[PDB]
């Protein structure tokens, strides 16, 4: 009830703020990150290729999509087409971060054609935890608006498997659950998509150190890479902070590994366990703030 709240504010408010955290950071190897920067453990001003592309305390492209994702969503579920307009207007502004697959799947967005690009990049993963926050009771209604969601630009079956993993986990979390058994529910729920990936979300019962695992299952931007270790740092750490800590200085694909761990970890641990650091240094709160007001009152009823 008065803890849903405290819940979805901690998990829209984690996904941002993971995904600027770990901005500055996307695109370098672990000893980059520490020659360029140290152990990080708050904002820091860009030394990687963003370096004068973006402020520092700033949201990437991984929020700027699920904000599109959160304006076109209604009890109903997803609205497609204010969705892919919202996309469409995004990538219009010339952002300085967009990723290669997000503008081919923008670009046949334009040309009224929705079938989207075929790639495995977690594009699709980044922006679902929206879905996961106002569908958390029902993962065949979550299920369907997921597929529907991340289709229309990434077409495959990983990338799909992919993004209903954290929607998963963000609507378990939501409900207090955290434990290993998640993993082989999971894998039942996505199985039927890609037995694949969803056997490689097991593997992760055989890890217990974080660094074997991200140098196992790999932090680019393939979507089985960045989704299982991320799910793996969610399981494997046992505060919000902790969990943040090594996914923003794990190397690779960093912000997006980053902003999903968050919107788990924030669903589950909720707003107040947020070190205020974090919220104080994110920068234009109050845009977020609306957009977790609106998805409270959306799951609200
Ligand atoms: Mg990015």
């Not at 504010?9 to 984690?14: E, I, K, M, Y």
């Amino acid at each position: 009830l008065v803890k849903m709240r405290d819940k979805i504010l901690g998990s829209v408010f984690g996904a941002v703020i993971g995904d600027a955290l770990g901005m500055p950071t996307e695109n370098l190897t672990k000893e980059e990150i520490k020659k360029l920067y140290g152990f990080v453990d708050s904002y820091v001003e860009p030394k990687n290729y963003l370096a004068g592309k973006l402020n520092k305390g700033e949201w990437t492209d991984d929020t700027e999509q699920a904000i599109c994702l959160i304006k076109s969503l209604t009890k109903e579920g997803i609205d497609i087409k204010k969705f892919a307009n919202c996309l469409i207007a995004w990538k219009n502004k010339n952002p300085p971060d967009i990723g290669l697959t997000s503008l081919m799947a923008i670009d046949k967005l334009e040309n009224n054609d929705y079938s989207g690009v075929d790639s495995s990049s977690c594009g699709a993963a980044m922006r679902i935890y929206p879905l996961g926050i106002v569908f958390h009771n029902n993962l065949k209604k979550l299920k369907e608006e997921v597929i529907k969601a991340s289709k229309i630009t990434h077409n495959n079956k990983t990338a799909i498997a992919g993004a209903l993993a954290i929607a998963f986990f963000v609507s378990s979390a939501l409900k207090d659950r955290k434990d290993f058994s998640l993993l082989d529910e999971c894998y039942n729920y996505i199985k039927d998509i890609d037995e694949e990936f969803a056997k490689k979300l097991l593997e992760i019962k055989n890890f217990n150190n974080l660094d074997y695992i991200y140098d196992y299952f790999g932090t680019g931007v393939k979507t089985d890479e960045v989704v299982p270790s991320a799910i793996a740092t969610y399981l494997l750490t046992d505060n919000f902070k902790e969990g943040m800590l090594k996914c923003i200085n794990a190397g690779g694909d960093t912000d997006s590994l980053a902003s999903m761990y968050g919107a788990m970890a924030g669903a589950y641990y909720g707003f107040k366990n947020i070190p205020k650091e974090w919220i104080d240094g994110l920068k234009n709160k109050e845009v977020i703030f609306e957009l977790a007001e609106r998805l409270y009152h959306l799951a609200t009823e």
